[PDB]
Structures are given as structure tokens and as C-alpha cells.
């Protein structure tokens, strides 16, 4: 009735690092070798067929379909023995003796007059039948799920598995044996309705019948093995060529345990055992040491890593985990149910997750969050989910078909989605809230041959015999080709424009070399143990890394020599960060709770304090200066984490959402309301502000704006079949011509009158090299070095820009500090400028020389790094001006200057501007932007199309060639997405870094480092089809196409 | 040739778009089903009456390894060594036929 | 049908509409050196320093052999079983005597 014995969060990771070492179990000096590497193939169906092999070296079965050690899921066996009764052998090779009936080991048995049925924790059940000629042994006959889906097995004479048949009584697989080893499988074949055949895998055996070689349908060897006299494996070789060699030894227990492992790359490991005390030691060539201590049950109780971190565990009968204890004393505790189902977990902070299950099956009925909010589920008598209920009370409904496949979803507000499924378990037709279907088409092998959208456009795919993708193709005719090698360790991607990108790997599968279209070679270097050491750039400059015993990043060196050194606590968390300049240091210190979450940051600039909710969602923040004033922020979320209120020194921001999660409306500090009427996502979306209609959108069957109303005038859009914007018109005009790579190469502005046209030229890698205008009034040419450092024209057509330090370009000159930060800039338009930086690498003070002398501008930053105020002082500290900002989640919303207020309204959730509102009350005036494809504005129109402000730009940095305004006084500063012009210095702000439009580069390296790319000063390959609004949610520390810690 | 006269009877042919013979008829009947590699894998002889069908199985290299008839009155299986030397069935499923000298096959 | 080539990789591949791949590998002179069928059957060639074929090795392992004269004219050919053919050439690069020797009368 239970206790069926056998013989073999942060806590869930510590436990998994000690149970197994190197595939080598810790307590048992054995092997376990099962993963996707041994997953020979997989077939579609209501019940998938997964051919997963397993090797243990501890099972006692000397014979089988694949030899000693190896096992297959369909070799399950049941034996009946005298009481000193019933025994079950699983896929993993664990001998389970039940006896004469739920068990805590996740196994259920019940015997019927004619057969026996075993159900696991989930709905999968397996049915045995008596073995012909033997009443003391049983063999697998049927498999099934909670639904009616099932698999049958048909055996041959001599009791050898022959066929596997599906629920519809149709054969799928067939086994073929040999003559030398009739008990060993040789080939596996697949059957189609056409009575055809196709081989999937082949096996070759040694002189002892032990599996030695595996081959695919294409005859390419994938895996090799070798064996000792006792059938114990000593060598296994993967597909990439990597060879692992083992050794075995005999102990006083008359059981064989592994003692030594090595490879062809120099990696080595040595194991030592002391069974009296249950102690296991592991040693490496690097002199690293690991220690484990286990109990008589062969369960781990003590773990000691290379760093002397100590973990302890407590075990209960039936092999359940009760408690885990960390080096700091923090205790994780668990509590189960009578059936073994987990009920509660509690962590050192005392925040508990709880769940209440059912009785018929192991299904969760209620879930509880640490805050107390609960999720409710109610099921169908067959186990299928029928409805879900959230804390807010909003319900969701599902309908399940006969075979347990969902066919209709009803969400809140009555929105309905419907689906049709294939007999093999493959989706065919999907419908949205409206009648807009997307359909699929499948090939004989069961892959996605084609996809059909609402408009009827077809996309086609051509696969290999093994399913590996080769080509993708569109209706317009463009195609993409992929080149791969099973063992060649080479891959290639061919752009629709014909250009190829190559990748080369190593024996471990790690990327080693990349080659671009123009031969730019990027290389990587690895240690014997697989740890990255050097990353070598296109030009030759290399970044370097150095790792500690625990494989935690210790030191990072950039191109210029600037180094970062990290210090880790006893629980694998950083507490000290040191930045050393290239040939004084900067130190940041941290203080964190028992869990990983951060409380305090200390810098020479001051102190920062944080406060979270039990769900690890930030609720309060503070910064206190060094003997100075203090500022603070507060937040307030909803039951689902939705942010409802944000309170700061500026005031209060209030949001209200819909049941679908959309942002229905918002309230400003000035108490005005923004309302947005969603239909989930579709037509007749509207923006109303406080009662004044601003813009109403009419959308197409893909939910793309085809018409936009901007007052008394309307704007229309026309898109291509492939989905690219082709033309735009404005009548109460413009055309874009692209390339095969979707780059923008031509832009016509007039068709009804003398056409004005513009051109751009790109390299194969997207870098823009030239620019011309149809008026012939402009001409620009750009030259780039490898690694994308701009060059000063043909004067320096060839030459290395060291460390990506741009020193001169035309009349500009730059100077750089030891940390890579610009300090001095020299030009003619605005003279010489100097900059000063905070400890967090932020810009505070800019000094400029003017006819009035040395003017100054100082920037004020909030706790999170956002910009709130800017102040300009003339000489002798005489204030000239001040401007203040109001954000809305990393997106500018309002700005305020002397008796002036400006509100920005965007389109959708992007940074792209749509409308600008000036003044309050009767003084409110509404104006509309006319943006380009990149969001860069070109004219600002009142109603009736009056161009109040017009601009023309260069390609880079939207540097102004001409601007014109009449009586309108407010300045336009938006420029690119995320940017705001600072006329007092001429450098854009973005959100976290300043941008120099003269050279198209940032003035300081990326705070996050290599995550942003190899070049730390780069904005993008081209500013016409790329964006980088952040220049880098909430950032506790510190690109897109058209380790740092966060919340 | 779409039509051929053979005396008092006429014969008609129907070809696929790709150019492969698909069916043939003879009235004053037969159908071929191919594979993606254009190999012949099925041959039906009757459509107006009880259909009689035949099958063939090929390797990836085109070598024919099996043959079956819809009447179930015939069954043949062929095993080849590397270099395409016929083998005497499973009795010699593996082994080198030296110099392509075939010495025995069934009673020969 | 898909074709795979390398500008300097000296590897080529043809993918049948049925999905199966045939591979060819060349040498520094561009001469074919190895062929691999869909099922791994490997056919190999051997060349002399001067680019003259010497051996043609079959799928199983049996090899045909060749021997050339000063003028790069075929002199001797050996089959798998040892049967040899020897050619005699006149003063104007034309054959006048053909001798077939059985494996161990002509």
C-alpha cells in the first residue's frame, strides 16, 4: 500500500549540482547517459513516439534488444517471485519491489483477474499481459494517456517486438533483426499509408553483442562506443569527434565504480571513495577539490563545492526532501501531502507558496501566491482544463475535443478563438476574434510545408530527409538558403541578396570563428576546460577574461586596458565592483538580503536604498547624498503586478487597465485624462484626451493602420504583399523603393508635380557608404574601417583606429580619459567644450565658451538614472534657464519651461511621436507630427496642414541642414526615437547615454558591455532602418530593427 | 503520342505536367504512381474491375530491394553487398564477394 | 534540387528531390579525390606527384591499378583479379600490340 523500496529556486539548483557529477552519479560510482544526444528520432501523433535510449552500467539485465546496459522504453518487464512478491523494472533500470496500491515513489498499481495495469503520477498508464509459456513474467502490451489515445505492440514468434501500431490500428514502425545476433535490433523502419518504407536508424554490434556503432538514414556515423571484458563502457565518442575515456576499479564491496575520466583536450578528473563514512572526493588537474557525503539510502546530505561553500539536506523515508540549509543558515522547508504531492515551500524570508490538489488525479485545484492572492481551476471529468479564474475574478473558458485538443478559447469580454486540428496532432486552421484565418499545410514526413495568411500570401519551406531546414521562400520570389554539415562543423546562411555568412565550430560545438560577407573575421579562444578566454575583433584588438575556481567571472579587460574586477559573497552574489583605469579606481559596494535581491548600493557619490514587495517587485526607492539632501520614489502595483500608481517629487501618475491588460487610460499630475478605446487590437481605436478627439484609426485585416485622421485632413497608407510600407498619401505622394534585403534605397516625395527623389547606397553588411539627393544640392560619402570606425575620408582610407578611439574627423578633435570617456571636444561651430562625469559614469557638468564667457549646464539625475532637470548658468553663477521633465516608464511624457508645458502623445506603445499638446485650458493647442519611417519628424502641422516647423536632415545624427519657424516659439527637439536635442551643447540625450550627431557615435562606452555588440561606441549600422532608443522596466545597476540586474 | 491506332482498336496515353506517363487506356485501365525521384513504385492494372496492384521498393541509390504483387501470389527480396554484388539472402547478409565473382545463389 | 559549393572549401554536394545528398571532395589541383554516396559508400582515387592516376579504389576495398610511360600514354592496366593488359605504341602514338595476361596463356 506504499513504501515501495528500490536501489539507485536556489535549492533546486544546489540539489541538481550535487546529485550528478562530471553523467556520473555521486553516491553510486556509475554512469547515466541519456539526453537529446541519444534521442535518435521523434514522430508526430496523438501519442508521440520518442526513441530515447539509456545506459546505466548498474542494471543486471545481461541481454536485451540492444545489449548489456542499454535499455529502451518498450522493454518494460514485470516479475513475480516468492514472498521472501511482485517486482517492476523501469526504463532507468531501477528494481522496484512492490510485493503483494499507491506508493510515494510516484507509482500506482492494481491487478485485475486477467492482467495488470500501472499508472504513474500523470495520466500515462501501461498495461501488461502474461508471457506465453511463462506465468512468472509479464510483457508490455499497451500504452495510453488519460484520454483514449493509446499505442499497441505486436510481437513476433519467439516473443520479439515487430510492430508498433497507433490508436487507429495503423502501423507506423517496424523492427528488423539480424542473423548473427537474432536477439539484437539492426534497423528501424517507418511506414507510410502508401505501403512504402524509409529507414531511420541502424545499429552495429561488436563480437560480444554490445552496441558499438550508431548510424543514421544517410549512413553517417553519429556515435561510437567501446567496452571492457565485463561489458563496462570505457570510451564513447560523439558526433563532433570529442572522445571521452573512463576507467573502472574493484572495491571490497565487489561492485565496480568509476575512478578516472579524461578526454583528448587535456581535461581530467579523478575520483576517490570512502564507503565507511560515505565520502566522495573529486579532483581535477587545476587542483580543484569537491566533497560529498551521502547516507545509507544513497541520498546526498552534504555538498561542498570548490569554493568551500557548504550545503546540508534533510531526507525522509520514501525519498522526499524536507529541508535544505545554506552556508548562511537560511532554511528552505517543504511539506507534502498524503499522496506525496508538494503542498508548501517556505524560504528564509518566510514567503510561502501553497497549492491544494485533488484526489482523483494529481491535479492542482487552487494556487496561492505569497501575497495571498489565489488562482482557481476547475476541470473536466477527463482531467482537461475547462476554466481558470484569476484573483481579479476574470474568467477564461476552454473547450476540448474528443482527443484532448483545445478547439475554442473564450476569454473575458466574449472574445472567441477557434481552431481545427489534424489527426496526427498538428494544427491546421487558426482564427482570431474576427473571421481572419491562418492555415497550415504539412508534408508526408510531417513537417510544415507551407503557411497561408489572411490575405492569401504563401510561404514555402523545403526540408531534408532528417527534417533539417534547407530553404525558405516567399510569394514575391525571394529565397533564403541554409547550409549545414552533419559532421563538417560548418554552417552558412545565404541572404536573399546572395551574400553568405559562415560559422565554424569546434569539437565541443562551441562557436570558434565567424566570417561576414566581406571577409571580416571574428574569432574566439577557449581553454582546455571550455572556458572563454579571449574574444578577438575584426581588426585584431582582443578582449580578455579570467575565471575563478567556481567558473564565476572574475576579471574583464577591454581593448584599452581598462579592467573590471568582481568580488563575490558566500552565496554567488557580487558585493564589490572595482574599475581600474588604463595605464584612480572607482569602487561600488553592495549589501543584499539573504536571498539575492539587492538592498543598498554605496558609491563615493552617496547611498541608494531599495525596498521590495514579497513578489520581488520594487515598491520604494531612495537616494541620499553625501552630507546633503534626500529624495525618494514610491510605487503601487495590482494583484497581477500591473503598475497602477507612481509617486515622485513631481507628482502622481495614475493608470487604469482593462481585463485584457491594455492601458485603458492615464491621469497626469495636472489631472487631465488620456483615454484610448481598444477592441483588444483592431479597428476604431481612438484617442480622446479629456473629450477632444485627436486621432481615430481605421485598420486592415492584419491590424495595420490603413487610414489615420489628423483633424480636418486624413492620411492613407498602402502596404506591399510582403508587408513593407510602399506609399503614403495625405488628402482631405510619397513612395519607398526597397532592395532584396529590405533596405531602403529610394524615397520619392512627389508624383503629382516635379518629382524629388533621394538615394542611398549600402554595403552587403548594411553599412551606408553614400547618399545623394535628387536636387543635386547634397552629396555625402562615408568610409569605414573594419569594426565600423568612421574614417576621415580618403586621407585615411586605410588605417586602424586603435581601440575605437576616434580622434579627428574634418575639423573636430577629441580627447579621451583612461576610462574611455570624452573629456574635451574641439570644433569651430561651438568652440571648445569640456565634460565632467560622476562615479556612475554619468554626465553632470558641461562647460562651454561663449561671448558671455564660460557658461555652464548641470544635469540632475533621479535614483534610477533618469533625467529630471537641466539648468544653465552663465558666468558668476547667474542662472539663465531651467527645464524639467516628467517621465512615464522610460518614455518622456511632459516637459516644462518658463510658463510653458508640452505634452507628447505617441502612437501605440513605441517611442514614435504622433501629437504634441501645448498649454492648458482654453489655451490648449493640438499639433501633429509627420514622421519618416524611422520616426524622425520632418514637419509639424497644425490642423489644415500649415507647416509650422519644417526640417531637412543629413543621414547621420539628424544633423540639421535647414530649419524654419514663424511665430511659433516652442522648440522641437525630439529627433530620433528616444532622443531630445540639447541646443546648449548640441548633443542628444537618448535615455542613458549622449549621442554626437557629427560622427554618429556615443560619447561613452556601453554600460552593459559586450551584450550590446563588439563596438562599445556604436549607435547602429545605419540610422534609416535601425533604432536604439535606450542607448543601453527598471535598472537597479547603472538595438532593434525596423551581468546587469533589472526588476 | 497521345493516341495510337493498332487496327480495329485504339490506345490512348495521358501524361503528367512534368512529362511522366501516368495512365494508358485501350478502348475501340493502367496507372503508374511514381516517387519524388521519378522511380516507379506502383502499377495498377484495373480500375473498372477488381484492381490488381503491384509494388516495388528502392533504396536511396535506386537499387531495388523488394517486390510484391497485389494478388499476394508472389514475393521477392534482394540483398546487395557494396559494389552491387547480389547476395544469397540472409545466409550471407554480410560478406565480401571477392572481385565481383558470384559463386553461388540458391541452387546455382 | 539544391547544390552546395565552396569557393575554396573544395567540397560540393547535390541534394536529390527526395532529400538525399551526394558529396564530392577534390584536391589542390582540382582533381576529384573522393566520392560519397547517399549511404556512405566511399569511392576513392589516388594520384601521383605529377597528376597521373595510379589507383582507383572501389566501395568494398578492391582497387584497379594503372601504370604510365614517359609520354603519359597508358601502358598497363590491372583489374581486381590480377588480369593485366599491356599496350604497345608505334612511333606515332598509335597502338599496334595488345597483350592480355591471365590472373595467377596470353
Residue numbers in the entry:
A (entry chain A): 268 to 275, 289 to 302, 305 to 366, 371 to 386, 395 to 877, 891 to 1039, 1051 to 1350, 1408 to 1413, ...
B (entry chain B): 1012 to 1039, 1051 to 1130
C (entry chain B): 774 to 877, 891 to 892
The authors write:
The type VI secretion system (T6SS) is a widespread protein export apparatus found in Gram-negative bacteria. Here, we present the structures of the T6SS effector RhsA from Pseudomonas protegens and its cognate T6SS spike protein, VgrG1, at 3.3 Å resolution.
We previously demonstrated that a fragment of RhsA lacking its N-terminal prePAAR motif and TMD (residues 74–1486), RhsAΔTMD, is stable in the absence of its EagR1 chaperone and can be purified to homogeneity as a soluble protein when over-expressed in Escherichia coli. The raw images and 2D class averages suggest that RhsAΔTMD forms a stable dimer in solution, which facilitated structure determination due to the increased size of the particles. The high quality of the map allowed us to build an atomic model of 75% of the protein, comprising residues 268–275, 289–302, 305–366, 371–386, 395–871, 891–1039 and 1051–1350. The 25% of remaining unresolved regions correspond to the PAAR domain (residues 75–267) and the toxin domain (residues 1351–1486), indicating that these regions likely exhibit a high degree of flexibility. Our structural data show that the C-terminal aspartyl protease domain of RhsA seals the cocoon-shaped structure at one end, while the other end is capped by an N-terminal domain that adopts a smaller structure. This N-terminal domain of the barrel, formed by residues 268–386, caps the cocoon structure in a manner that is reminiscent of how a cork is used to plug a champagne bottle and thus we refer to it as the N-terminal plug domain (RhsAplug).
